[PDB]
Design a protein around this ligand. Structure first.
Ligand code: HEC
Ligand code: HEC
Ligand code: HEC
Length: 68
């Protein structure tokens, strides 16, 4: 999908898949044929999400991802 929401206790995270793709291109996150990427607390706080944000305006602070 173009937008993915990860409902959770700390506050729902909205992942705008389309927006990220437009700015980075598919191979920024997908190796080979684009397929689903398992997202959980551990991956999100590391290489699947947070790590890349450390180089841009991307959110690294808790509230930048977790809203309410
Ligand atoms: C990192 C910021 C990404 C970029 C850039 C693109 N994709 Fe992605 N994609 C990413 C994640 C974290 C996930 C999992 C989302 C979830 O369901 O939790 C995905 C998933 C896909 C899928 C899987 C099938 C589906 O149900 O959508 C496809 C087919 C996919 N991504 C395609 C794709 C293409 C072609 C991209 C360039 C336009 C692209 N992605 C960029 C993360 C990232
Ligand atoms: C680089 C390879 C990235 C990965 C992996 C993820 N994100 Fe990202 N994110 C990236 C950029 C370049 C930006 C900055 C946008 C800009 O133009 O300044 C962002 C931004 C976000 C945001 C902030 C609000 C928004 O503009 O959408 C959120 C909430 C966000 N990213 C979430 C997010 C999640 C949950 C990811 C893993 C599924 C993820 N990002 C990966 C670059 C990269
Ligand atoms: C965006 C790059 C994030 C930042 C920065 C932080 N978190 Fe996060 N967190 C993010 C996602 C996409 C997820 C996965 C949700 C899922 O579907 O499983 C999480 C999850 C958590 C959780 C677990 C919530 C639960 O109900 O189990 C916690 C407790 C959590 N995150 C805490 C947290 C804190 C305090 C942060 C600052 C250090 C933080 N997160 C940043 C994405 C992102």
């Amino acid at each position: 999908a173009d937008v993915v929401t990860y409902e959770n206790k700390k506050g729902n995270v909205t992942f705008d898949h389309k927006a990220h793709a437009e700015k980075l291109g598919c191979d920024a996150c997908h190796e080979g044929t684009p397929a689903k990427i398992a997202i959980d607390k551990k991956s999100a706080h590391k290489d699947a999400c947070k790590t890349c944000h450390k180089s841009n305006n991307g959110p690294t602070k808790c509230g930048g991802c977790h809203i309410k």
